[PDB]
Ligand binder design. Structure first.
Ligand SMILES: O=C1Cc2cc(Nc3nc(Cl)ncc3Br)ccc2N1
Ligand SMILES: O=C1Cc2cc(Nc3nc(Cl)ncc3Br)ccc2N1
Ligand SMILES: [Cl-]
Ligand SMILES: [Cl-]
Lengths: 124, 4, 124, 4
């Protein structure tokens, strides 16, 4: 086509989606990770995770307001990944890399899994 | 704005 | 912080949100523009438009499944802008620039209004 | 991935 493109549009959209998350505006699901609860937008979760994409395209699960993750999932690892989904920034540290990678594999977040594997390979 |  | 960032994340999120729109997945509102109807995600509309941000943060309007725009609004201008919201690409043409700018002013989409004003100034 |  003959379209023009606004370079910062996608980033500005995500920044606004994160502002809505911070103020709990139009969040439509609670993700339960053991004793912790995380409110989010189903569409954003689906856009970032192969697991959430599969869950919310399911004709029955699409209508659930609460999703319980596998008990092996670490709440901090999930929190770091939820922040990444809404910001593009990943808080990857020596103390959390194993939990973050395990959570990203479960959530089917391929690019996060890739950088975790590379950071781990560098320290061996 | 750019030409994509 | 000491975060790393995935450059393409925001773009990939928006591409996935547009795929959901194309398959009518988790769309939660219909925007009526005269005889035309456009299905969309309230969160995406709010993230792109000052008008939709104000509408869906309203305690009564936040629960509406149908929003009727002002009858002066052109359905093609709205369609071009809805596509821009979900892709960052604006199909700006000599034949549609006036309708697109009028719609972007109504929707409170400042960057679109700015490029329309510049393209119009160049042709005078 | 980059250093932002
Ligand atoms: O690593 C990742 C991230 C991700 C996101 C989605 N999400 C969607 N995929 C498609 Cl094709 N359409 C709409 C949506 Br929402 C699917 C798989 C994966 N794997
Ligand atoms: O030209 C534009 C585009 C736009 C988008 C929003 N959307 C939001 N703004 C804020 Cl501050 N927080 C969350 C959201 Br969603 C508000 C105003 C405007 N004006
Ligand atoms: Cl990823
Ligand atoms: Cl804009």
């Amino acid at each position: 086509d003959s379209c023009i493109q606004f370079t910062r549009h996608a980033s500005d959209v995500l920044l606004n989606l994160n502002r809505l998350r911070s103020r709990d505006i139009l969040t439509d699901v609670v993700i339960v990770v053991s004793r912790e609860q995380f409110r989010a937008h189903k569409t954003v979760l689906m856009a970032c995770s192969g697991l959430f994409y599969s869950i919310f395209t399911d004709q029955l699960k699409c209508n659930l307001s609460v999703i319980n993750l596998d008990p092996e999932i670490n709440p901090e690892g999930f929190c770091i990944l939820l922040d990444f989904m809404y910001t593009s920034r990943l808080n990857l540290r020596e103390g959390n890399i194993m939990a973050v990678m395990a959570t990203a594999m479960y959530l089917q977040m391929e690019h996060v899994v890739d950088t975790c594997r590379k950071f781990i390979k560098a320290s061996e | 704005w750019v030409i994509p």
